[PDB]
Design a binder for this molecule. Sequence first.
Ligand SMILES: COc1ccc(C[C@@]2(O)NC(=S)NC2=O)c(OC)c1
Ligand code: NA
Ligand code: NA
Ligand SMILES: [Zn+2]
Length: 258
Amino acid sequence: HHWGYGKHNGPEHWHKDFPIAKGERQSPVDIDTHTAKYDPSLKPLSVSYDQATSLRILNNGHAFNVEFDDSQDKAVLKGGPLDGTYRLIQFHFHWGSLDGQGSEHTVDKKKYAAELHLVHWNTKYGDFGKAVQQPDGLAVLGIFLKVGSAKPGLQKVVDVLDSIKTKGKSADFTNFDPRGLLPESLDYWTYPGSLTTPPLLECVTWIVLKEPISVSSEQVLKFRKLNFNGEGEPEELMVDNWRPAQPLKNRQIKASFK
Ligand SMILES: COc1ccc(C[C@@]2(O)NC(=S)NC2=O)c(OC)c1
Ligand code: NA
Ligand code: NA
Ligand SMILES: [Zn+2]
């Protein structure tokens, strides 16, 4: 598989190798704020990241992943729409070539400059590979980024990017606190969906925060200096690594807030 984001291998082509691309619960989606309904059944959301143990940062040719130690319940997501306990495994971003695009989810068709995905897996399935085979295997916390003031807690990430410019490069990335990437409010929208890249598995409960975080133009500029290519290959800047909104089909988006 040679999928990517270009004219020749991008989202419009993915269905040929991954027919689920045209499935019934694909992500991302547009969040129509007028039609999303408040749900009183949602329990309070619990983001418990005090004991998170970051390990490494990896350019995988599609994004960069900050990976965590998930060999025990160190950083977990619970509550909201979720039954049981979901362990943080990694986070990554999707972003644009320009400040007016880059997010995967949209809000009333508005695109943000970037979107953060904090990936968690349901511990009842024992390991991540088993969890992605289940309809309730993953919970992804999605956070929008807008350009304005710098986000202090993002700067350690920005500053290591020079060391992982190209596909396959990694760097030690210990002692990073993901709490510094969250907005003040945990108000959210939730719906059942999918991974947003191949293999496009329909295994995700999406929890998308309403409040964006602000990052500086200089911060997002540094994301845009990354490369899709490997070392020694022609330079292809890592920009516009987002999938557009997909059909909602037979789903409702629930709001946690009145
Ligand atoms: C086989 O397991 C995979 C494969 C790819 C992704 C990445 C991604 O498709 N999904 C989200 S979230 N954004 C993405 O880019 C993944 O994420 C948990 C899990
Ligand atoms: Na809730
Ligand atoms: Na399903
Ligand atoms: Zn993602």
